């Protein structure tokens, strides 16, 4: 067949490789990006399409404009189970029109020396003397099977990671996802009979009936347009999740019409730290392949482009030194660690104390405000939960008369303080990995017995 040659293979267009493509353009690097779907159907993963701001400046990525940008989000209100308490968390994103902007991301990354080919499926997987060189590639729209050989392989499949599962198992990139570490999430875009009260403002319901391992959502696309939906914990048993959608929908969207239905579905969603290392002998893994997804809020649209942008980092400096092993793609996991990687094996644990806490649980945490506004986001945006505010909290939760895990919460804060370090503390070397690896498996393991 016919053998091209590419400094970056990029596998996989959405948030994750779009980003990966715009960061690493114009910097002396041949790179080819493919994706299976048509270039109109690119990046239309079901999703919340909901994205903070501060991602966009932080990575200096072009802001979401005209079409690309539905509806300005100012802030989230938080719902209890017996939706007494409505708690009010402010602060700047976007709703998306997620295939328009990530298409643009492409095309303005293509105008920057980036090829891309739509329509274009990585099959196998060029793994010779113990590297990955590249991928072979289906293109039907001219029907070709291409060889395509790189230097470093860029991995951004999404949940699916159809790319380095192929990959021989004596690779650690090649970890797999644990039932219990991800969430199924299903959504619908819907028109509204009346105008949406503060459309400006993302509704999300916490219920551990409706939603057992996650909750319900309600995003306004507009004054009219909303997208709604859940996410439950897998591997527990639970039934199919359009049951819980289909039995619970009127409770938390009793405006939309279900006549005016635009689109839906669903997807598989991480829910836990990422890989223990996101770069191997030629190949980096970024995105949902490579679990990028915050633990908490299941948001991994903005943490995506964060794997993409470290990807670019660590891959122009293998070129600096002419080194493409582990080692000299290792800063991929120094940089996204630092960025984002610490907060989520610290909400990792953190996840694991929410999903086990009861309806009578949360009703009383809200109503009796065991944390307030300023340590909440401070704890979703840098994974801290401080000693100071959970013993302010634990104040609070002396006064509960009936058992509860919630007594537990200086003891997980203190499990989350620990792993936090633990990462920080990541391995210079992946010769130290295995040894670092069995040690936050330690901390997973005890914390896991700690809650019962
Ligand atoms: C229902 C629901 C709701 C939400 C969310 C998920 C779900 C399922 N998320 C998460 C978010 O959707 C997701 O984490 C990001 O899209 C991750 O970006 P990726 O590009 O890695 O995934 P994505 O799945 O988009 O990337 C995979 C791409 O690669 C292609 N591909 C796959 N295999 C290939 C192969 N072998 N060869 C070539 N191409 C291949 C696919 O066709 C696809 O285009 C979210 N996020 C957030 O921050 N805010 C939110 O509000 C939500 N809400």
Redesign the pocket.
Known sequence: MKELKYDVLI???????SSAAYQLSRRGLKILL????PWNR??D???????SKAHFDKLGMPYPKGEELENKINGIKLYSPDMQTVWTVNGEGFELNAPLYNQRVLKEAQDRGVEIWDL????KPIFEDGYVKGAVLFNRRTNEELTVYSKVVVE?????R??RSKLPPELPITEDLDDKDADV???EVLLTKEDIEDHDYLRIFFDQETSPGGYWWY?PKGKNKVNV?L?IQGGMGYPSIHEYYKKYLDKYAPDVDKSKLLVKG????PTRRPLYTMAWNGIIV????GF??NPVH???????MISGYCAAKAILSAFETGDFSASGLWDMNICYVNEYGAKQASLDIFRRFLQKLSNDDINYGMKKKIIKEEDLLEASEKGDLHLSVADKAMRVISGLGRPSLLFKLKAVAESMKKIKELYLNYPRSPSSLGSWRREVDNVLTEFNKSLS
Do not use: Q
């Not at 951004?156 to 699916?160: E, H, K, L, M, V």
């Open positions: 596998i996989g267009g959405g948030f994750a490789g493919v994706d299976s779907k690119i990046g993963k079901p999703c919340g399409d909901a994205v274009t499926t990585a099959m951004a499949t999404g949940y699916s159809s790319f999430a299903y959504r995003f939906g996410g669903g997807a598989l969603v970024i995105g949902d392949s990028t997804v299941g948001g991994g649209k903005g943490s995506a």
